[PDB]
């Protein structure tokens with residue numbers, strides 16, 4: 001037997017995922033379903049009030065055009081999330097023992113996929129939690145931002161809605177995020193073997209986890225792995241979309257040091 | 265939710281049908297590629313002269329492109345016939361049958377093309393010829409770099425060491441994908457797929473007992489399939505805007521028409 005070891009690994013990852021991330025899926029769902037009401041941002045006037053009252057970092061002026069300020073706010077939050085994911089990664093058994101350059105490579109090419117996944121935990125069909133659950137910004141507001149910005153937001157919701165239909169919880173997600181990080185096919189890896197060995201363990205752990213936590217949900221393991229397809233696809237789209245924005249928009253300028261920090 | 269004996273029954277059914285539908289199996293392709301036999305030896309095409317001589321025994325970049333296109337159309341036909349054998353498939357809504365094939369055929373062609381490849385080239389003309397990777401990769405203009413990604417994929421996929429019995433179930437899983445755009449009734453597709461996935465999982469554990477998480481590693485390859493089918497389309501579009509000298513079979517045109 002090694003069931004106990006797989007459960008040990010699951011528990012280890014769950015405990016660490018709780019410590020590393022500000023707002024769990026469990027907490028975010030309580031807020032979204034309406035089980036300390038979040039401040040709601042559904043239009044320009046309500047944004048003005050929220051930033052004036054709740055004082056949201058990421059959406060506070062440092063460009064004066066709202067659509068840009070919100071776009072940049074997403075960029076800023078994603079960079080903050082990279083540090084959370086980084087810290088989480090260090091807790092995955094075997095990860096810190098990898099070649100240092102491979103650690104960096106794994107995080108570099110994994111973070112986009114992870115941020116999409118985890119963003120779904122904070123979204124439903126009607127909008128997204130921000131500032132650790134204190135704010136709730138509506139899908140319609142985001143989707144109706146002008147020019148390319150509105151069309152940049154909506155794909156994230158489309159993805160989340162489909163992902164959320166699997167009804168994963170945090171104990172499930174902790175293992176799934178681990179699997180994503182330990183992907184042996186990232187470009188420029190020096191030593192793939194020990195990465196795939198760790199991944200094989202995480203996959204075993206995720207499989208057992210899903211059978212016990214969702215015994216009625218046939219082939220959930222397979223369905224979840226199939227979602228890596230949608231993850232890679234949307235990360236590719238993401239890059240194409242940013243580039244068009246870079247080429248087109250003249251008014252995106254921040255202080256150079258900010259650009260450096262939030263270069264992403 | 266299915267008993268083992270039924271999962272084994274379904275694997276046997278699909279293997280049998282794969283054999284009937286596809287002329288050149290992986291098992292036959294490997295026997296040809298590894299050689300050590302007198303009767304099954306391919307003529308090898310590695311340059312212009314050898315191409316000339318190959319036609320006698322069995323613009324160049326266009327001729328080869330058209331060669332690939334022609335085989336691909338044949339492959340669609342073979343895949344379509346295999347699909348009809350998959351329990352439940354013909355029972356689906358007819359529009360959904362079309363949709364499943366439309367999105368699925370390209371992924372399957374790449375999968376099955378890998379069976380005919382090693383790192384040095386690809387079987388052609390039902391195993392009678394072998395064209396080298398170096399020759400294909402050195403075709404001019406856009407054509408060379410349209411050939412090479414096929415090999416890049418095959419080398420990785422072939423590392424899993426699937427056999428035909430395995431691939432029959434894997435191909436079936438690809439076709440019955442409930443996430444294809446425009447599907448009208450996802451539920452009955454996903455119910456068939458869940459059976460195929462159970463069948464694949466048991467098949468892999470029995471046929472490759474020492475190969476840990478082969479199931480998962482195989483599903484992860486559906487990711488690479490989706491990516492390369494997408495790049496394919498982008499690349500073919502760019503070809504279709506330099507090359508009027510090259511035209512596309514209606515069947516493939518239609519498959520591409522709105523992907």
Ligand SMILES: Cc1cccc(C)c1C(=O)n1nc(-c2ccc(C(=O)O)cc2OCc2ccccc2)c2cc(Cl)ccc21
Pocket residue numbers: 058059070071073074075077078081111112115116118119122128129130137142152153156
């Ligand atoms: C820029 C980026 C790089 C990599 C991955 C993604 C998805 C993006 C991106 O385009 N994003 N990223 C958020 C976002 C992500 C994670 C969290 C969190 O708390 O875990 C929060 C996020 O956004 C909160 C937010 C929403 C609106 C304004 C400011 C912050 C994201 C969110 C949306 Cl709605 C759209 C695109 C997003």
Ligand SMILES: Cc1cccc(C)c1C(=O)n1nc(-c2ccc(C(=O)O)cc2OCc2ccccc2)c2cc(Cl)ccc21
Pocket residue numbers: 328331332333335336339370373374376377380386387388395400410411414516
């Ligand atoms: C044009 C096309 C449309 C749709 C799908 C694909 C992959 C292509 C394409 O770019 N292809 N397609 C082959 C090919 C596929 C399947 C078989 C087989 O027998 O099952 C054979 C194939 O090629 C045989 C061949 C190779 C060289 C010369 C003449 C025939 C394909 C093969 C390569 Cl090496 C590169 C691109 C290919």
